Assembly symmetry: C2
């Protein structure tokens, strides 16, 4: 039940505790930062404030101001009028309180508090320079093949999914790109439930009994169209369990001249089915790469009801760090509010949540101990428009708060998949 | 500048499909060089006369959250009755809708107008899946008001008795609408969870004849 492993390696939840338990509070108003001390006895005499402004990851300004705050007191810090941003994007402000001198309990340079705000945002209005290339639609009884130069997209007409992609003669997928509404159950999803003594109120059991894990996709529609400068693929699927429709998924794929695939997804969720664990897509990628790069919340694991500690910046970690090694394996390694993701030859743009690793949701839920896991061929990807909270007020009864349950009935998300 | 903002056209293309015609548009609302709103739409007209409209709006994070995200027009038709499947039968808003019930409702046009002595936005009905007026039918998941008075007349006139009915019927169909508040009437009182602050909004509508 610990915040740390038995060998004292931190769980991701330790960072969330550090941030919420901070001793300095911050408000922003125009160009003024207000800092409040929550110390009862000491002055801030080993503290200074580092601030920085970045446009979509790229720094534009930074600076330092010594902190001089009495117990329970306030200090007003006025930012210099900041250089105007050139292009489009959202400006972000980050502050951190740094301890310059070593103590009996910390190293010099130790970070004790932090906070972020959105500043000015300029929206992209200018039409991206209209390219000339034009994608080529090839139709057979079993498939739709889209070709742009030497890039190839294959849609299966029987199953209704993007079943393979090609750059030249190099294939990208080991498993087709499909919808996903399930996660490998966390301890909070399971609670005190067991094979010998089932607890029907637990999230895992409501999910099992409704047939979420056994749901079979059934194609409703699958059409292909040529436009002026692109090809459009329209699909619709029903997920059913023994006659009862659980979810309907409606998608458009738009592949244009610049070689980008715009995916638009619209999902309906039956009001009387237990709210699903996630609403997204998954596939098994052929490529295994070293690093993972993203513009979003990080660097550590973060979930919708546990993402306050994470900051919005540009992050770059090795693949093995995007997986959290819980002793009892479960869904893990998510990062939220991501605008861009980069892995090997692939780039994904939008506003989504993701995890990425060598283990599939199926392997994670079938294995009881972490040492028993084996890396699978390629890399398993999950990209969710929406993901249920993880809870934790206790681990023996539903604890996910109402504002974190996927309960809206109708959902929308869009992604762009291209090459970097 | 929300009231003074002018729609600038970014894109407007047409494509013929196997069974339909698809119109794509994009607009940007600006004031003194700042982009407030961007609206991206597709209209799809299929073989059965139905028009499917898809809208995606971006709102600038540093502009004050908008009062509504929707569409308007002035219809030529003046009909006796309004018929809808949604919350009703009385006026209801996102932070004042619990009393309303979901069902099929049917009222004379004049009932779709609340005669507040000082005139303002009035008459909204929320959580609607279907609206009927004359030979028109709208389907989706939206909020609406319908009346003989433009938002503009309503905002320029000070006493209800000084209002005059306009030719035809003004229709407002919103994907989203800001709460009304009222914990008091002398400071901002709309609670955070009823402000339109998500930055990106999506809604869809089918328009047909019946
Ligand atoms: Na008025």
């Amino acid at each position: 039940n610990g915040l740390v492993f038995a060998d004292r390696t931190p769980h991701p939840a330790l960072t969330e505790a550090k941030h919420q338990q901070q001793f300095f509070q911050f408000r922003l108003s125009g160009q003024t930062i207000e800092v409040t001390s929550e110390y009862l006895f000491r002055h801030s005499d080993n503290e200074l404030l580092h601030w920085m402004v970045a446009l979509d990851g790229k720094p534009l300004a930074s600076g330092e101001v010594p902190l001089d705050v009495a117990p329970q007191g306030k200090q007003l810090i006025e930012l210099p009028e900041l250089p105007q941003p050139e292009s489009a994007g959202q400006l972000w402000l980050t502050v951190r309180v740094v301890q310059p001198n070593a103590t009996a309990w910390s190293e010099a340079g130790h970070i004790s508090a932090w906070q972020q705000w959105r500043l000015a945002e300029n929206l992209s209005v200018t039409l991206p320079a209209a390219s000339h290339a034009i994608p080529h639609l090839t139709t057979s009884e079993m498939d739709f093949c889209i070709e742009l130069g030497n890039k190839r997209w294959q849609f299966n007409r029987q199953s209704g999914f993007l079943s393979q992609m090609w750059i030249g003669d190099k294939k990208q997928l080991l498993t087709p790109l499909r919808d996903q509404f399930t996660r490998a159950p966390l301890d909070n999803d399971i609670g005190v439930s067991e094979a010998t003594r089932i607890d029907p109120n637990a999230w895992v059991e409501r999910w099992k009994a409704a047939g979420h894990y056994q749901a079979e996709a059934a194609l409703l529609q699958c059409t292909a169209d040529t436009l002026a400068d692109a090809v459009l693929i329209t699909t619709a699927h029903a997920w059913q369990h023994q006659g009862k429709t659980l979810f309907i998924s409606r998608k458009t794929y738009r592949i244009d001249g610049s070689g980008q695939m715009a995916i638009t997804v619209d999902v309906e969720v039956a009001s009387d089915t237990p709210h699903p664990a996630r609403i997204g897509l998954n596939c098994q990628l052929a490529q295994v790469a070293e690093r993972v790069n993203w513009l979003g919340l990080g660097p550590q694991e973060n979930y919708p009801d546990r993402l306050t500690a994470a900051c919005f910046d540009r992050w770059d970690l090795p693949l093995s760090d995007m997986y959290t090694p819980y002793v009892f394996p479960s869904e893990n390694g998510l990062r939220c509010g991501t605008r861009e993701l980069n892995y090997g030859p692939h780039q994904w743009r939008g506003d989504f949540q993701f995890n990425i690793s060598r283990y599939s949701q199926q392997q994670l839920m079938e294995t009881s101990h972490r040492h028993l896991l084996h890396a699978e061929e390629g890399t398993w990807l999950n990209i969710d428009g929406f993901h249920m909270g993880i809870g934790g007020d206790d681990s023996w009864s539903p604890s996910v708060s109402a504002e974190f349950q996927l309960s809206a009935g109708r959902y929308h998300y869009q992604l762009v998949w291209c090459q970097k």
